[PDB]
Structure 1
Amino acid sequence: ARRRRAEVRQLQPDLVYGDVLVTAFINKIMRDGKKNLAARIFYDACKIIQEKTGQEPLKVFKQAVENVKPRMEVRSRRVGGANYQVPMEVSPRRQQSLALRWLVQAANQRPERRAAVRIAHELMDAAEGKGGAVKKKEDVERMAEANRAYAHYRW
């Protein structure tokens, strides 16, 4: 935005866990406005996660989210007229967004037929340091460690 910052739409905590981080993740599964379907998927995957390795789902979800937040990423610059890959630290809001986005994106990569299973399994791998969204987060952090020479082109 040009004139003022953008203010963050505070979401409504979900009804099963009362958690805001959960609804943002539900909103990322949602397509074409079908929220109820997109809620069953996260919840069907949730019950799965209490079966496959009996653990409280809320903890397995946040452990995947916490292990997908990238602390750094490259951005573009301009100085002189040359555009490099400038490393810059990630704001907490954007870390959250990239995680949930990459989680679903990583989830829908998998070769499983039913949705909630793909959701359950990526959350399972990511909360243990494996899977699609974790390859991506590390990949992003590794590219930024590479271009630390251009860290002085930070703003």
Structure 2
Amino acid sequence: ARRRRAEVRQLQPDLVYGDVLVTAFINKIMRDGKKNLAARIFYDACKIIQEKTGQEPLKVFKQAVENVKPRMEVRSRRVGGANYQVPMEVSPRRQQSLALRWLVQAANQRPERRAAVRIAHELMDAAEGKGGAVKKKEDVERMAEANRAYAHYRW
């Protein structure tokens, strides 16, 4: 992107919750364009969070995401023969991106054999404040901050 600033693709609201953030999460889950297989996985998970929990799946979702968003991160830079982890605030658009990506990433690290279960648990497990997705989010924030000395390199 050297000329313009690329406008963000606007997604199609969820087939069930009419939410755009859901389509995203689904997309991230999807691999090899198997959007059907993807969608189902998320949904089955929604029904799994619906059981083991009394709270609505949609709301559990929102929360987890919110909990896994990083508000700070270190972006490496060159300064007179040396690379520095420069803490940088994190763009809202990028937060949602990193959050959704991480959940799925962490989710597939889990031990439970069934996909939907892994998403299910990771998701609810996230809204609880725990889970590997949230640990990544924290390690990142710990990374930033911990280099506040190189913060004057605003970037």
Alpha-carbon shift at residue 16 of structure 1 (Å): 0.2
Residue 154 of structure 1: CA displacement?
Answer: 1.5
Q: Which residue of 2 aligns with 1:134?
A: 134
> Secondary structure of 2:74's partner?
strand
- The Cα offsets for residues 113-146 of structure 1, whole Å up to 9 and x where unpaired, read as 1100000000011101101100000000001010
- The corresponding residue for 2:79 is 79
Residue 79 of structure 1: how far off its partner (Å)? 2.4
Deviation at 1:7, TM superposition (A): 1.1
Alpha-carbon deviations, 1:80-101, whole Å to 9, x = none?
A: 2321100000000000000000
Structure with greater proportional helix content: 1
CA displacement, residues 29-66 of structure 1 (integer Å, 9 cap, x when unaligned): 00000000000000000001110111111100000000
Q: Deviations over 1:5-44 (max 9, x none)?
A: 1210011111100001100000000000000000000000
Q: Helix, strand or coil: the match of 1:32?
A: coil
**TM-score normalised to structure 1 length:** 0.98
Distance (whole Å) between structure 2 residues aligned to residue 88 and residue 73 of structure 1: 5
Partner SS, residue 128 of structure 2? coil
Runs of 4+ aligned residues of structure 1 deviating over 3 Å after TM superposition are none
Unaligned 5+ runs, structure 1: none
How far, CA to CA, are the matches of 1:111 and 1:121 in structure 2?
A: 11
Would you say how many aligned residue pairs link Structure 1 and Structure 2? 155
CA distance in 1, matches of 2:13, 2:92: 19
Corresponding residue of 1:125: 125
RMSD: 0.7
Equivalence for 1:34: 34
Q: Distance in 2 between matches of 1:109 and 1:148?
A: 31
- Which secondary structure state, in structure 2, belongs to the residue aligned with residue 85 of structure 1? strand
Percent identity over the alignment? 100
CA distance in structure 2 between the aligned counterparts of 1:81 and 1:34, rounded to whole angstroms: 46
